[PDB]
């Protein structure tokens, strides 16, 4: 039951990212870097923000479970 959750996450992310590539072209929405080298910094921001979000408190995490389930 664990990695089925991460496949379910990756699938809806993949299906939603197709809206940002209408018929073969990357549109104005993605634009990960605007200068040379900015994309690697945008990578290093996100891969650290993902680590920062998992060391949250149990009460915050338990609130975040139920509010995601309420909004979905």
């Amino acid at each position: 039951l664990e990695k089925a959750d991460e496949f379910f996450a990756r699938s809806v992310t993949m299906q939603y990212k197709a809206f940002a590539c209408p018929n073969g072209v990357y549109d104005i929405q993605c634009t990960e870097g605007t200068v040379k080298g900015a994309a690697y910094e945008k990578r290093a921001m996100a891969v650290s923000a993902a680590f920062r979000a998992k060391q949250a408190s149990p009460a915050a995490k338990a609130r975040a479970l139920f509010e995601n389930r309420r909004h979905a």
């Binding site: 018929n23 073969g24 072209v25 990357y26 990960e32 040379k36 994309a39």
Partner: protein, 164 residues
């Protein structure tokens, strides 16, 4: 407007990077295919009143029920609009042959076509019959070159895979 150039420039723009060697390498393939893809486009341009002439009545020979009362092709202006609907698709095939990608087809012919043909109650099977008739009697030594024929046929069944 998806094409060879249009793909690599937005890839380089989304990465925020200059055109690399792989970007310039893809345009050489456009240069090498221009001498077989443009021959099909002008052959279609110089011959297009006879090709949609034989496709539109091949649509009606397969489905003769379309001229019944209450149908999509009852009276004369519906049939005249059907020949126009076919000529619009052949013009977009000529445009995709000129561009290099399938951009003109999915920009102006494919996108939203299923919503139109459903609520206006037109059968898509009668659309794909005329396109399949055009694809099946393309005869590759006489009508085109050997290489222009598969370039012409590869865009035709893109319509058939998109409408079905």
């Amino acid at each position: 407007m998806k094409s060879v150039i249009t793909t690599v420039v937005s890839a380089a723009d989304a990465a925020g990077r200059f055109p690399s060697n792989s970007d310039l390498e893809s345009i050489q393939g456009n240069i090498q295919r221009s001498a077989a893809r443009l021959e099909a486009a002008e052959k279609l341009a110089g011959n297009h009143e006879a090709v949609v002439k034989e496709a539109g009545d091949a649509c009606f020979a397969k489905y003769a029920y379309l001229k019944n009362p209450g149908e999509a092709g009852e009276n004369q202006e519906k049939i005249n609009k059907c020949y126009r609907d076919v000529d619009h698709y052949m013009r977009l095939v000529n445009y995709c042959l000129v561009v290099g990608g399938t951009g003109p087809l999915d920009e102006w012919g494919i996108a939203g076509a299923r919503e139109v043909y459903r609520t206006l109650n037109l059968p898509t099977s009668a659309y794909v019959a005329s396109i399949a008739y055009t694809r099946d009697r393309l005869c590759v030594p006489r009508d085109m070159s050997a290489q222009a024929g598969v370039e012409f046929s590869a865009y035709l069944d893109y319509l058939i895979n998109a409408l079905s």
